[PDB]
Design a binder for this molecule. Sequence first.
Ligand SMILES: COCC(COC)n1c(-c2cc(C)c(=O)n(C)c2)nc2cc(N3CCOCC3)ccc21
Length: 125
Amino acid sequence: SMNPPPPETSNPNKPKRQTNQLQYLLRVVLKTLWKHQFAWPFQQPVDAVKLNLPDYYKIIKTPMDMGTIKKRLENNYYWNAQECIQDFNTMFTNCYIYNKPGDDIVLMAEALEKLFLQKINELPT
Ligand SMILES: COCC(COC)n1c(-c2cc(C)c(=O)n(C)c2)nc2cc(N3CCOCC3)ccc21
């Protein structure tokens, strides 16, 4: 059991643009979640070898983490704000698929998801 390569943070065969929404997702949404006290388990891909979680990448076939989302925003990987919001949703959903109710990681995901929703609420037009 080993780790997959992390998600792509670059697509050479994809146009790029700067929008108010993408800038807000990096500078306000991601930055706010990144600095939250419960951010640390979500700042990098799950390392199944280091943490000894051999069934993680048997159960989770669409991994996502805030380190990947950060790099995607910084590299102008996303064309649509929807793509970035979908990646956050995937990250939270994976946590609820793999882990059990009352697990520390699940209550941490709940706290971050609540904050995420409050910040996306004020996403500009
Ligand atoms: C609160 O989460 C605890 C779990 C423990 O998994 C066995 N965990 C995850 C983790 C995260 C997610 C989203 C998940 O689903 N699982 C199962 C584990 N990522 C981690 C990273 C670290 N370290 C801290 C020191 O620096 C290196 C990294 C330490 C613990 C971690």
